[PDB]
Design a protein around this ligand. Structure first.
Ligand code: D10
Ligand code: D10
Ligand code: D10
Lengths: 254, 254, 254
């Protein structure tokens, strides 16, 4: 059973990576509107990131005796996302950073933000639509779209965790811009793995409002402000701390 | 209580970073003597590193159920030190490396070493002077300036830990000189976090004679040679191993 | 006893690094045949990597209460191998990568593969020949050349672990080619440490057919196909996945 349970989980994620890769190839051959192409690529990139993260989290909770096993898979798939999702953010907090600490206009930023939000809801539905066709034994429940409360620490602790992780990732994302592309993807994948390892036991270390929407949508519906604070406000506060540090403090300090 | 306990701890460290940042700005505007400016900046940089590390260690022991939570804060503040303390070492072992494996003259090296030692004692006093004004509930004890014996492993194990960590950090510090500044700070912050994670449970992973003086001054007074060996001799032995490896062995090997 | 037990373990590894360093220097002064020089250097590099890994694993199992202590030593010696074993692979899977995803001819690749295999068997014999002269208390058993079954996870889990680790390391090895040499060695040492930390509790995280031959030769003899699948097939499958990803998928995707 576990032989079929594990193979199906990896197979679906590799299927999704190939399926969104083909969709990117197809879109790149019949989408000559720059705004429309920006929307579709962001929709595909967010869908891949959400579905793979959904499967990775489900794999982890089915394998509690080997926490280090999923850590390598988290690194592997973070590296895969970097190599295949070039030119996208798949993160609303990343879009605010490029609009504020960068040259991204609000016109293209609004389209990317919308594409991420539609993809996050679509990824959850496809996540719920999948796992209902049979396949894995644990997929039969399909999580029953039941809130699991990813955050167990206090409200203040979770906000600090998400703000610091958002600050740590996006500052590196901003500071690795001039770095060689191949090296940068490996560095960001390593940083993502550390943040997940550091924050996964406390908050889940999402620092991604769109990804948190797909993972914990039913948690959001039950208690909106508490989840909206931890996963939408706190990561956005890490981006604001980058503005204060890298636009006001450091330029004046040096 | 824990909501006020945690907020005060972060608030003080961010206060110190801003307060030493302003002092650096003020010093940079009224200190035209190059030797005097070198002393003050090293005093401010060592004070910030000692006070933040004091608060981080105190936060960690108050939060034993979430060891990964402090790990992100350790990374965050290591990154902050790299961004704000440019041009300083805040490490006596780093000064020996620049005097020996570098062009730093003993004239400027002696001033930096003194500034670190005055700052380490001043940081401890300000650490003891603080926490006595009330503020946090656990601050009321203010650690009671009581030896906590940071090293529990055998004497040989702790010496190896401090020598290897000093070798690992300072070799990277030497080898990341040509690396882009923004990338280098992120890499050294990650390395610091690993060494603290790897060595914190055994020695504390200081590899910094000045920082160890502030953290464990009362431990030093009770048993000097044992702490002087682990925290002053062993880190200095890691620098010597770098001289043997990178000046004698490797040049002859290649 | 443990003071002598630990000092002997570090002393032998540093002795081997110096002894293979001198042999490399001697070979570089009396070997004018390029094929012969390629064989000897690969034999010396594989011997150093196998013997140090043998001692590191033996140190780790003698020190179960301080798992983080050996992690720093694993990083330290991985960094040492990078600095002293320049121009070699010490990995059969690395040789396939250079023959397939690179310009290494099969003529020089076959000599390197043979040199690794002779060294792995010679390292095991010298490992068994050593520890029989007395020295450490735990060396007296000298592991009794008894199978320890490094893999406890299921067959499917171990194959995934070795394939992913081989993919993760060798893709970074391929993508760090243009990176500065000094930075690259530090990055690969960090990646090796993570893979060992991530995979050591499940498989041992070898992703090195030659190294696995020396470590678990008696395990190989007892149950060949099961160990040949995990340590020879699975790492070679990670290299094949790199070919599919970096020669077929990514070029067509972008
Ligand atoms: C602790 C989990 C994350 C560790 C990542 C280390 C990667 C090294 C640089 C590629
Ligand atoms: C920025 C490179 C990745 C950071 C990983 C640091 C891990 C340290 C704690 C294990
Ligand atoms: C030099 C970059 C930081 C090194 C971190 C390695 C962590 C490996 C064990 C988790």
């Amino acid at each position: 059973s576990e032989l079929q349970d594990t193979c199906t989980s990896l197979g679906l994620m590799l299927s999704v990576v190939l399926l969104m890769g083909l969709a990117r190839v197809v879109a790149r051959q019949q989408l000559h509107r720059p705004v429309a192409h920006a929307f579709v690529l962001e929709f595909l990139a967010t869908f891949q990131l959400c579905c793979c993260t959904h499967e990775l989290q489900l794999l982890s909770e089915q394998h509690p005796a080997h926490p280090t096993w999923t850590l390598t898979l988290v690194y592997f798939f973070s590296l895969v996302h970097g190599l295949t999702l070039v030119g996208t953010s798949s993160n609303p907090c990343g879009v605010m950073m490029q609009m504020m600490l960068g040259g991204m206009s609000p016109e293209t930023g609004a389209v990317r933000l919308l594409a991420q939000l539609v993809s996050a809801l679509c990824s959850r539905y496809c996540t719920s639509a999948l796992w209902s066709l049979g396949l894995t034994q644990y997929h039969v429940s399909e999580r029953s779209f039941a809130c699991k409360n990813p955050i167990r620490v206090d409200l203040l602790k979770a906000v600090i965790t998400e703000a610091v992780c958002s600050f740590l990732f996006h500052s590196a994302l901003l500071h690795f811009q001039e770095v060689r592309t191949k090296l940068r993807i490996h560095l960001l994948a390593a940083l993502i793995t550390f943040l997940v390892y550091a924050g996964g036991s406390l908050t889940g270390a999402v620092f991604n409002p769109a990804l948190a929407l797909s993972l914990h949508f039913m948690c959001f519906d039950e208690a909106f402000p508490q989840f909206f604070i931890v996963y939408w406000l706190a990561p956005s506060l890490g981006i604001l701390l980058m503005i204060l540090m890298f636009s006001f403090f450091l330029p004046w300090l040096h």
